[PDB]
Amino acid sequence: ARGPRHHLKRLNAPHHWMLSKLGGTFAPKPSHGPHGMKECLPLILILRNRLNYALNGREVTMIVKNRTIKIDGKIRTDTRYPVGFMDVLSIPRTKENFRLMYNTKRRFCLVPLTAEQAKFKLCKIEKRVLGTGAIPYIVTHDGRTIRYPHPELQANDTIKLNLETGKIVDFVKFDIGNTAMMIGGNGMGRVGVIVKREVHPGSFEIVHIKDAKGNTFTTRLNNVFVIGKGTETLVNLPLDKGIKKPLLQQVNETIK
Amino acid sequence: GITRDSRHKRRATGGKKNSMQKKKKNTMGRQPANTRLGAIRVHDVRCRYGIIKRRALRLENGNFSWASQSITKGTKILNVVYNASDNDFVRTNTLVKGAIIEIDPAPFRLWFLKFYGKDIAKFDEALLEGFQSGRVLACISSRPGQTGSVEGYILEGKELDFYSKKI
Amino acid sequence: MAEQTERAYQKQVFHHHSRNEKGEIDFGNVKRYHKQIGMGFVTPAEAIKGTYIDKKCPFTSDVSIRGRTLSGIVKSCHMKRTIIVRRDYFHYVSKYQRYEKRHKNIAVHCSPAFRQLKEGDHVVIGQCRPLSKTVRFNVLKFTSRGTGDKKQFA
Amino acid sequence: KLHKIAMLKEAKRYAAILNRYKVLKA
Amino acid sequence: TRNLIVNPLLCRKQVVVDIYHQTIVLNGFVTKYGGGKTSGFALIYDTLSALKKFVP
RNA sequence: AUUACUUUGAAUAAAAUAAGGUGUUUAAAGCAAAACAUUAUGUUAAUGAAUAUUCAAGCAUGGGACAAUGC
RNA sequence: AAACUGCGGACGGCUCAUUAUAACAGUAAUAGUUUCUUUGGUUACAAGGAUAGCUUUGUGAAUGAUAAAGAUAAUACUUGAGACAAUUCAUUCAAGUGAGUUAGGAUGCCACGACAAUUGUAGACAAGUAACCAAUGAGAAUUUCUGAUCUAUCAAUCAGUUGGUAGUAUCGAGGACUACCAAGAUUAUAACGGAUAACGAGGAAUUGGGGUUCGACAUCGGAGAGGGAGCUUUACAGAUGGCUACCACUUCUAAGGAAGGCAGCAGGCGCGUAAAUUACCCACUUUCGAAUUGAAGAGGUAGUGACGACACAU
């Protein structure tokens, strides 16, 4: 370990990729960029497995080096580009648009989108600091740096982005009556309404959230990602609509 | 090379510390450069991550700041008169942080003439004596072995009495 | 005057001159800097009124207090601005389903704000940056306890 | 060009309208 | 037969051949034990310009 | 007032163990294949077991009987 | 084609000698440090020499050996308009955060100083470049708390040792090092020693419950390349399929001299009760590179295989 690691063994790959343990000895290490190593899905994984457009890494290169895949509004030619959250994924040759969303099974699922709703994106602010020259800027969960923002854009809120222009369209305050989709631990993919926000002076903020079906659970403030205001979502949720069937129903529905 | 790891020390219990690895570049130190007084002599040292450190082997001039008058001037360093760590630094005129040095207040006097119309050769009494004697007391506040320059400030009321009584 | 007992001049990390009655910076004096640490810890009056100088005191310096926080009993107060804190805890041995008594000594830094701190007192400590080879904690509050005819103060 | 105010005026477009909603502050 | 994937990005159609007994490439064919059923996977490379371009 | 105890969680790499589904002809396996749609169409945006662990520490929460330091 | 320039060989592969709070596991901190890559942003109608491949003459038994001369290019090396940023110091006005004279602004000063004097006619669009912010980064590195096998025919151990101040060095805290000061630090709840046929963990074998024994070896972390030591390049190495010196070896030799490190894949000697082919290919997984194409004893396929596991003939 004299320097950065470039390989990634298959067994050490993040679990929610579901790489077969006998397929090979290696896993595609996602190149650095917007999203972390374990909060992202490499572009090769999306095409080969989730969509079956390519059957091996050889054929993923031919698709991507043909300049045929658009991440956000830009077009990426990196086979291991890290695609994480609701960052849109557009394939104009097949005339289809997907959004990389979570689901209740702690997995990345591609939500189909229309062309008019694939032109926008929701970003979660991470910090707001004063730059040099008293120029404020915000850093989003995507990793974008945005110049002079609205003064009400605080640390933990959510904003709507216009992909073609990069402007800010709509912002949602992080309050105690707004929808949120969890992105962290056991709540991964769950959608509910914030009902309580308790703070500990030293370590963490723990948020109590009530599910649409009346279920209640808790998570750390890090995993909260506000989707909309007043139980109304700005994005189309996956098929389960952020509702976790408590075990028995999932087992019974798989039998049927 | 010189090492800064704690694997060669002893535990808080006094027990000897056995060896598992060899020396590594992470805990690498370098030979100190005792910045003396003389003709300008600086070297560029490649540090870790490619950054460059200005190693000042010898210097004569320096920029000194007068707090009361809110000015900073370049000045030739005359002598080193007090080092709170080692007395051997006094004889060799070694330039380090916190070393009370003596500089000629020529630019400061000229600035006073152009600004007030008067000459110095209320202010604390010992400050006037330094002006007329041609040697005022200043404290080095930079790290010449790292930044490659002598940045300091002219001593004033409470700091001057303490350091003057030491001499 | 009584804190200048070393070869160098002792100054605070953040030393600034106050303004005189006429509204201009008075270079003839220095403001006594004092900050307040975080999670529900009050600044002792000695850190405000007192004239001591310390670059490792959590109340009058730039040393921060980070997440870890413990408690214990003062063991020794012979070293300067440093004390040894002993923590007594129970270790659970799974096979016998019984606990055993253990202890560990932590070398922590005691600022001159706590003047009435002696051996045997109960002390709450917090974790800061390494201030020595072993000193990596700082005293935040203390409570006096019973005496043992040996009042060894800091 | 890009550099020449095609971008740079943005940096005075951007700047200016910022000091507007910094001055509402009510 | 079985499923269709329309893949214009690779200029390709792919099917799972289910035998109940140049543009064509056949791969991964194996029968069931005891004769009879044979399965496989087919490769419709349409135009003969992809086949060469998109073919090892 | 703390600690201990206890109940719920948070957070926590997989592989492995247990365990859910799936006729590798059974099985050990694999996490794929199809059951039927006689399947391009559709179930389908198909499965990924809730996959649970898990001790000794650490964090939060409800209770204070049994215990230690209270002061 | 070759060559200059750029990137890479610090990843991957092998082994377990060292190692007894060391390493490792969970945990927490970095308001005590931080690169490389990638990603989002921000800040003259064109100048100067010389160098390889090239040509020519050569030496040596010889190495991945080398000498002279004559030319010739730059996204190699420089100068230079295009107009701030970032560092140190001194003073000062001060809002998020649990908490900061804190991000930030102002004054004066020093050093540093730009957005190739760049590239496609074709696949304006590209492409390239310097600094500075931020992400990548729950990464790397240090550090906090808790947790190890046997031994008292090991009972006292320590003098940079324990702390303080000032400094030095480092990317950075820090006795990491130096000067002065004080006498401190650990120990019967087992310190300091000694042993290990001891790398740690996830885990493995056997178990009614409790447990006992094992873990070199899939994966994570650590360490090493015959033994120490010292360094170069670079963003990352105290690198060894890099270099220097000493010790122990091995090989070529024209006797003058020269390189080499299979604890990489095959294979050979020795050792032992004890362990396989001097095979084929980048088609799978993935890594590197100027890049859809080239390499890869990583990886895959094949050969030996009563270590084991499953079904099944007579």
PDB file of C-alpha atoms (C1' of nucleotides) in Angstrom, chain G residues 1 10-11 13 32 39 47 79 89 135 140 147 149 154 159 173 175-176 213 230 243 259 265 269 275 277-278 300 303:
ATOM      1  C1'   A G   1       8.980   2.249 -37.996  1.00  0.00           C
ATOM      2  C1'   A G  10       3.997   2.915  -5.732  1.00  0.00           C
ATOM      3  C1'   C G  11      -1.818  -1.066  -8.781  1.00  0.00           C
ATOM      4  C1'   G G  13       1.342 -11.075  -8.012  1.00  0.00           C
ATOM      5  C1'   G G  32      -4.050  18.626  14.117  1.00  0.00           C
ATOM      6  C1'   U G  39     -15.864  15.790 -11.563  1.00  0.00           C
ATOM      7  C1'   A G  47      10.025  35.687 -29.734  1.00  0.00           C
ATOM      8  C1'   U G  79      11.656  35.101 -22.458  1.00  0.00           C
ATOM      9  C1'   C G  89       3.813  38.732   9.193  1.00  0.00           C
ATOM     10  C1'   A G 135     -16.119  17.169  -4.399  1.00  0.00           C
ATOM     11  C1'   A G 140      -4.598   7.813   2.793  1.00  0.00           C
ATOM     12  C1'   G G 147     -10.577  -5.857  23.580  1.00  0.00           C
ATOM     13  C1'   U G 149      -1.815 -17.140  24.505  1.00  0.00           C
ATOM     14  C1'   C G 154      10.320 -12.930  35.797  1.00  0.00           C
ATOM     15  C1'   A G 159      16.679   8.806  32.803  1.00  0.00           C
ATOM     16  C1'   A G 173      -0.148  17.121  16.143  1.00  0.00           C
ATOM     17  C1'   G G 175      10.343  14.656  23.422  1.00  0.00           C
ATOM     18  C1'   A G 176       9.817  13.659  16.922  1.00  0.00           C
ATOM     19  C1'   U G 213      -8.775 -26.409  19.546  1.00  0.00           C
ATOM     20  C1'   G G 230      21.671   5.217   2.792  1.00  0.00           C
ATOM     21  C1'   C G 243      20.254   2.912  -7.552  1.00  0.00           C
ATOM     22  C1'   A G 259      25.293  -7.895 -13.768  1.00  0.00           C
ATOM     23  C1'   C G 265       4.339 -18.054 -13.130  1.00  0.00           C
ATOM     24  C1'   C G 269      18.916 -28.832  -6.232  1.00  0.00           C
ATOM     25  C1'   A G 275       2.812 -31.185  -1.791  1.00  0.00           C
ATOM     26  C1'   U G 277       3.024 -28.713 -16.491  1.00  0.00           C
ATOM     27  C1'   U G 278       9.857 -25.565 -17.915  1.00  0.00           C
ATOM     28  C1'   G G 300      -9.243 -17.654 -18.492  1.00  0.00           C
ATOM     29  C1'   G G 303      -2.441 -31.361 -18.191  1.00  0.00           C
TER      30        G G 303
END
